[PDB]
């Protein structure tokens, strides 16, 4: 192209300000370039790629939601690592935090904690006594609650100083001043361990498979079913129209299948195998397996309708797919 | 009601012809009555319930697709077990088979084989030499190919007689007459064993779970996601609009969940657990678990947007669901 080589050139030189870079890197992902592609062409590491996209998204919130014009001048050319740490905030509480981080000329580590403070503090419908919702009070409320847990050292003083540096309101300053008179512990309980599961390396994950419908069915109905694209990293499946789905185990032949599809039918569509009576069967076919052979079953276009047969001799026919799985319903 | 007690009464008396019964039993399933309900009220066993629904569906094809008026007179009051065995045929080849089964006054076992013959024979684009597509020739072609495999007994004669009884065309009669002169084997290979899988009793099946979207998200987006109804016997899921899906393992807490929903997010929405860096996490919440407690995490309406927090004290809030699963993407 022409705009796909000029954007990459700007990044290769680090021409503009970092905000520009973040938008250029947005524009390349938008148009197909993965992190690894961009690092090949430009110098940009993929860590720094992510930092500046998100960083610019934050800077955008700093613009839309009304931070100081002095703030924007500073963060337009510097402080991508800092704005990146405000990512989990909201647009409105980003502009507030950004004004605060400019004011106190804050490095990225300290801004990570400022952001933690601002979120912890916005989980109050009724606010703590003496503290307002200005992020200075919020990071001062954090300095308050932390200093009380310590009972021993000059760390109390260091944290009391912090709270006084940051606090916005007079009421919060005095709430903090009280800790120079009042020496008691209030310790806090640690947060509960969240319910983590690990996908086991040693066994296989399930696969979601589309479902055309119950036989009797028409050849057009099967061919109208799109191929499914699993969206990494969690193998999601998004789809727009009407559809039915089934989640099946990760059998080897099913993970293998390039394009599988499910058809509900009965066991008497196939040769009777033992003595048991005709019941419901779930049939999986791979549409991308259409070469004949004499040991397997296939879905065929039987003049406008779907049918499962087998073949002793190469058929003068179109084969729509190959049957890879037959399964009866789970027991009682 | 009033029409839900009069239909059941007609079945309780066996008032009309069996075709009527099949439609009445259709009408009760249409309006909520399961097989077991109907057997409680009427005498009708649920085997005979199924036979007469399907049977009447076949009889319907006998009408639409133009069988003899004499046939319909016979099958209107008799022969439900016979028409049931023609179920896997098509509308057009049902009327043909029905004319044939009337003509030869055939019991249900023999009609099961007539139907097998008619389907095997319609898998020919080019037909066998001497045989037409009239079902008489088809069941005669079956008698032909079977008699050749035997080389020994009067079973050849019995089968030759059958073929001559049924055959429609003169050309097929002579194809069969030849087997009184010509005594050779042509044996046929048995059909391949189809690829059967059994759902293992001893381990758990996967569960398909809806996906709202990637945080940041709005409280309305989660509440607009319907509950999912798994359609037995294969736990299908059908849905009309736009939706995203994920198939997760059958963990105990997930099968338990009455109404689970998936939210994509990052690990730094929760307390940092070990040293590892913030990555993507998949979050499962049960919307039907909204009672507070101090050992777990919940999704809350944070003034119009979704948020995961925990609680030391009962919150003056609405809880939208409880977090039951956190999982990172599968390893490399």
Swiss-Prot record, chains A, B:
Residues 1-182 are annotated as: N-terminal alpha-helix. It is found in: Cytoplasm. It holds the Pfam family Raf1_N. One of its GO terms (cellular component) is cytoplasm. The keyword Chaperone applies. Keywords: Carbon dioxide fixation, Chaperone, Cytoplasm, Photosynthesis. It comes from the Bacteria. Its main location: cytoplasm. GO terms for biological process: carbon fixation; photosynthesis; ribulose bisphosphate carboxylase complex assembly. InterPro entries: RAF1 (IPR037494), Raf1_C (IPR040858), Raf1_cyn (IPR046382), Raf1_HTH (IPR040781), Raf1_N (IPR041358). The keyword Cytoplasm applies. Residues 206-332 are annotated as: C-terminal beta-sheet. Has 3 domains, the N-terminal alpha-helical domain, an extended flexible linker and the C-terminal beta-sheet domain. The 2 C-terminal beta-sheet domains are swapped and pack against each other to form the dimer interface. Homodimer. Forms an RbcL(8)-Raf1(8) complex. Each Raf1 dimer clamps the exterior of an RbcL dimer, protecting it. This insertion probably contributes to the assembly of RbcL(8). Forms complexes of many stoichiometries with RbcL with and without RbcS. RbcX and Raf1 can bind simultaneously to RbcL. Belongs to the RAF family. A major RuBisCO chaperone. Acts after GroEL-GroES chaperonin to fold and/or assemble the large subunit of RuBisCO (ccbL, rbcL). Cooperates with RbcX in RbcL folding, plays the major role in assembly of dimers into RbcL(8)-Raf1(8) intermediate complexes. RbcS replaces Raf1, leading to holoenzyme formation. This is RuBisCO accumulation factor 1. It comes from Nostoc sp. (strain PCC 7120 / SAG 25.82 / UTEX 2576).
């Amino acid at each position: 192209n022409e705009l796909a080589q000029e954007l990459l050139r700007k990044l290769r030189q680090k021409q503009g300000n970092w905000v520009e870079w973040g938008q250029a890197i947005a524009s390349l992902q938008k148009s197909g370039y993965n992190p690894q592609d961009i690092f090949e062409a430009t110098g940009f590491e993929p860590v720094q790629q992510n930092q500046v996209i998100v960083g610019s998204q934050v800077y955008n919130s700093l613009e839309k939601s009304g931070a100081s014009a002095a703030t924007l001048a500073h963060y337009a050319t510097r402080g991508s690592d800092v704005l990146y740490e405000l990512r989990l905030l909201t647009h409105e509480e980003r502009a507030a935090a950004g004004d605060l981080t400019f004011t106190h000329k804050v490095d990225a580590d300290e801004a990570r904690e400022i952001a933690k403070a601002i979120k912890d503090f916005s989980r109050f419908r009724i606010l703590p006594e003496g503290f307002s919702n200005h992020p200075g009070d919020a990071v001062a409320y954090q300095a308050w609650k932390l200093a009380r847990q310590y009972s021993d050292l000059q760390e109390r003083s260091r944290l009391i100083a912090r709270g006084l540096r940051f606090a916005h309101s007079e009421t919060a300053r005095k709430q903090i001043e009280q800790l120079l008179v009042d020496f008691t512990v209030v310790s806090q309980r640690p947060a509960p361990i969240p319910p983590f599961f690990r996908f086991d390396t040693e066994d296989e994950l399930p696969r979601i498979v589309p479902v055309v419908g119950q036989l009797p069915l028409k050849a057009e109905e099967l061919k109208a079913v799109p191929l499914v694209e699993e969206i990494e990293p969690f193998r999601l499946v998004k789809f727009s129209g009407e559809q039915a789905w089934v989640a099946l185990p990760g059998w080897q032949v099913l993970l293998a299948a390039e394009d599988p599809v499910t058809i509900l039918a009965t066991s008497d569509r196939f040769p009777k195998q033992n003595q048991t009576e005709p019941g419901p069967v779930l049939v999986v076919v791979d549409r991308s397996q259409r070469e004949w052979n004499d040991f397997s079953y296939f879905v065929v276009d039987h003049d406008g309708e779907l049918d499962f047969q087998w073949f002793e001799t190469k058929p003068e026919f179109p084969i729509l797919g190959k049957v890879i799985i037959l399964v009866r319903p789970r027991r009682i």
